[PDB]
Amino acid sequence: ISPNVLNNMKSYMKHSNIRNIIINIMAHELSVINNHIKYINELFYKLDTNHNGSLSHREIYTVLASVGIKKWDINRILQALDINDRGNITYTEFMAGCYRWKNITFLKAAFNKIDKDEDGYISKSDIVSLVHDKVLDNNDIDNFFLSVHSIINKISFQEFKDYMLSTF
Amino acid sequence: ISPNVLNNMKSYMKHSNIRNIIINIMAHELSVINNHIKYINELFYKLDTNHNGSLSHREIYTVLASVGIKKWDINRILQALDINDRGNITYTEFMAGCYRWKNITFLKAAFNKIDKDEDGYISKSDIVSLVHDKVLDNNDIDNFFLSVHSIINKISFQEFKDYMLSTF
Numbered sequence: 001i002s003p004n005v006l007n008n009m010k011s012y013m014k015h016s017n018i019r020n021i022i023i024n025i026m027a028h029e030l031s032v033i034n035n036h037i038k039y040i041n042e043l044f045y046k047l048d049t050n051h052n053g054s055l056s057h058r059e060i061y062t063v064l065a066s067v068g069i070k071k072w073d074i075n076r077i078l079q080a081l082d083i084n085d086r087g088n089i090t091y092t093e094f095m096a097g098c099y100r101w102k103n104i105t106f107l108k109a110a111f112n113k114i115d116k117d118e119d120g121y122i123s124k125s126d127i128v129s130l131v132h133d134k135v136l137d138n139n140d141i142d143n144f145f146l147s148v149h150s151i152i153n154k155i156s157f158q159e160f161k162d163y164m165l166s167t168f
Numbered sequence: 169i170s171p172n173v174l175n176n177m178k179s180y181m182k183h184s185n186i187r188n189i190i191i192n193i194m195a196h197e198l199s200v201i202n203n204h205i206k207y208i209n210e211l212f213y214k215l216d217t218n219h220n221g222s223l224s225h226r227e228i229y230t231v232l233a234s235v236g237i238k239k240w241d242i243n244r245i246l247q248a249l250d251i252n253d254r255g256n257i258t259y260t261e262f263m264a265g266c267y268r269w270k271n272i273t274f275l276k277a278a279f280n281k282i283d284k285d286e287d288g289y290i291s292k293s294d295i296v297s298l299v300h301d302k303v304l305d306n307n308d309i310d311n312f313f314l315s316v317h318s319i320i321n322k323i324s325f326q327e328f329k330d331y332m333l334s335t336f
């Protein structure tokens with residue numbers, strides 16, 4: 001096992017259950033992202049029929065054609081993808097055109113999930129709810145709020161962001 | 169091919185070469201992230217010796233022990249990872265403790281790469297430099313600056329962010 005993963009675990013073990021629950025929300029979002037990338041990865045592998053790790057115009061053309069994209073569209077896609085005009089398209093270049101960039105921050109999305117009522121503040125009750133399936137109690141929650149504010153018993157996105165960043 | 173990937177390509181083809189060059193910077197950052205996740209994925213697969221898609225305490229214990237982590241550390245890692253105290257640790261929970269969260273936004277990182285001199289503004293010369301390995305010229309660059317400001321011939325992070333978001 002790589003030392004960086006080992007060191008990550010050792011740092012993780014020192015934080016509170018609530019901090020790490022919050023980390024798990026973000027971890028779910030990485031899993032989702034990574035699933036999309038995996039599909040693109042499998043797509044790339046199928047297009048690369050000579051298995052040379054890059055895509056020619058023809059390799060992409062013949063597949064887009066067989067799936068209903070018309071010549072005029074395929075050619076515009078090809079010239080957008082081939083950003084270096086090399087006649088060979090890299091994994092990174094292919095994936096840039098395949099990935100849905102809409103809604104691309106991890107911390108903001110986690111905060112929004114926690115703020116159940118979308119009022120822009122994380123209340124005590126928002127944390128009670130977050131831990132509804134965990135054996136944690138009111139002592140743990142109070143500690144978390146003190147930690148956040150040691151850097152109104154409510155938390156703005158900025159105070160949320162500032163706390164989480166200080167734990168990395 | 170899934171229709172969402174096809175639609176992503178069709179939207180990508182409509183944007184400028186410079187917009188898409190900027191997208192490629194972010195795409196590289198997704199590749200990096202995805203490589204880390206792939207390692208964690210392969211690690212998870214090796215630990216899961218009964219291939220039931222989750223990790224018992226023992227499965228993790230026996231491996232951390234064989235690599236130099238001491239009992240007292242392994243146990244703290246186990247109780248941090250087992251966030252639901254289930255005796256079974258999920259892929260998401262494992263990955264939360266293995267991933268380096270330090271420096272976790274895509275647009276900010278792209279902007280910083282483009283702002284060569286770290287002055288907080290994207291100048292005309294920063295874009296000239298960005299396209300140094302592309303056949304693009306001064307006409308293309310001017311178009312890009314007009315587009316950004318149609319929503320000082322310089323670009324702040326906010327104006328950069330606002331333009332990119334409007335193209336998603």
Ligand SMILES: [Ca+2]
Nearest residue numbers: 048052054055
């Ligand atoms: Ca190929």
Ligand SMILES: [Ca+2]
Nearest residue numbers: 115119121123
């Ligand atoms: Ca709230």
Ligand SMILES: [Ca+2]
Nearest residue numbers: 216220222223
């Ligand atoms: Ca298992």
Ligand SMILES: [Ca+2]
Nearest residue numbers: 283287289291
């Ligand atoms: Ca600059």
